[PDB]
């Protein structure tokens, strides 16, 4: 299957030239699932949050986008309470040129620029749009909860 080969290329890219503030590694049992971590960007309410993710790749990953979700609890307007992420990079209009490091960089950059319109978490977006202090307080709360795993 060509899907596993491009996954091996993705692993080779992430092993030696991983993006700053991002790490990833598949289970040595099978490459079909990945564990990735996005360190919260500086000058952001999500700063230093070691937010974890689980990457689920289909058997036709070169064309079918992966299933990306958040394991550590996240409070973001464009992140579901389930942990699912709505990104136009994901789901529809996903391009076959996306290295795993590119997806992780996209999600990391999504932190500082949420979309209050078309909310995925209605409470999160409403707090972000009108209630910046409460929103940043809750983001700090979820960051502290994220640190607890270790």
């Amino acid at each position: 299957t060509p899907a596993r080969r491009r996954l091996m290329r993705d692993f080779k890219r992430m092993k030696e030239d991983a993006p700053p503030g991002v790490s990833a590694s598949p289970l040595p049992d099978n490459v079909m699932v990945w564990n990735a971590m996005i360190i919260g960007p500086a000058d952001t309410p999500y700063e230093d949050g070691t937010f974890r993710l689980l990457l689920e790749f289909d058997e036709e990953y070169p064309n079918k986008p992966p299933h990306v979700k958040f394991l550590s609890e996240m409070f973001h307007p464009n992140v579901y309470a389930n942990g699912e992420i709505c990104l136009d990079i994901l789901q529809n209009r996903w391009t076959p040129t996306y290295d795993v490091a590119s997806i992780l960089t996209s999600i990391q950059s999504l932190f500082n620029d949420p979309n209050p319109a078309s909310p995925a978490n209605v409470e999160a977006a409403t707090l972000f749009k009108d209630h910046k202090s409460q929103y940043v307080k809750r983001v700090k709360e979820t960051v502290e909860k994220s640190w607890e795993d270790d």
Binding site: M8, F11, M14, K15, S23, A24, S25, P26, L27, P28, V31, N35, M37, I39, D48, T50, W147, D150
Partner: peptide, 28 residues
């Protein structure tokens, strides 16, 4: 100080990731 603690925690997690990657490479 909080930066030091957070970066130590991140370093432990990154070391875990490095060990996972090395084990996966050894497996194939």
């Amino acid at each position: 100080r909080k930066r030091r603690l957070a970066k130590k925690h991140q370093a432990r997690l990154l070391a875990k990731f490095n060990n996972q990657q090395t084990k996966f490479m050894k497996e194939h």
